[PDB]
């Protein structure tokens, strides 16, 4: 895939998948409890490209074992909360040899991370 994936997670949600073309960002509640992601922020850095910040709704909770996929505007998906959210404000999550998606909670702290690195 030419993109080494480097992840680190300190909470109940880990970065399940990051789209290499920037269509979506996919997260999973890999724990056995629902995680409230209300007001949480997703900060997407694409190499040297400007950080892309997506903020969750103030009352948003990810059920345990489920998948939340924040699609971009160009992804064309339909919002289906809490399973599918469409970031129509951002055309794409971005591309580049350094695709890092860090999950930032409502307290402004990184709890999950995933980095795509290409030589």
């Amino acid at each position: 895939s030419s993109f080494s994936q480097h992840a680190r997670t300190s909470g109940r949600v880990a970065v399940e998948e990051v789209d290499e073309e920037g269509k979506f960002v996919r997260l999973r509640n890999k724990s056995n409890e629902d995680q409230s992601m209300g007001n949480w922020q997703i900060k997407r850095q694409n190499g040297d490209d400007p950080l892309l910040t997506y903020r969750f709704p103030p009352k948003f909770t990810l059920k345990a074992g489920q998948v939340v996929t924040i699609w971009a505007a160009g992804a064309g998906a339909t919002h289906s909360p809490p399973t599918d959210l469409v970031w129509k404000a951002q055309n794409t999550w971005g591309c580049g040899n350094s695709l890092r998606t860090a999950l930032i909670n409502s307290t402004g702290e990184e709890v999950a991370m995933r980095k795509l690195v290409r030589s």
Binding site: S4, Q5, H6, R8, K115, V117, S119
Partner: protein, 88 residues
Amino acid sequence: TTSQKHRDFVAEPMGEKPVGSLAGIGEVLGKKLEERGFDKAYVVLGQFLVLKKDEDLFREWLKDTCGANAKQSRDCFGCLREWCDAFL
């Protein structure tokens, strides 16, 4: 490009992995390193950080501390440097 051992070491934080967990560091070289005192991978990394992540310093020191060739020392430095980039 990369050994599977290297990718596995890079993907996750080292935690308390032994020095044998390092790419290009097997039973013999890791055992020699543990005998030298760097009994743990993070001790070797602290040595690497003290060397200011220097490739030549770390690789030559590894070669003189266990006997690794250019291949094994290079793989070990690459693994440590890539892990530092990923997490540090």
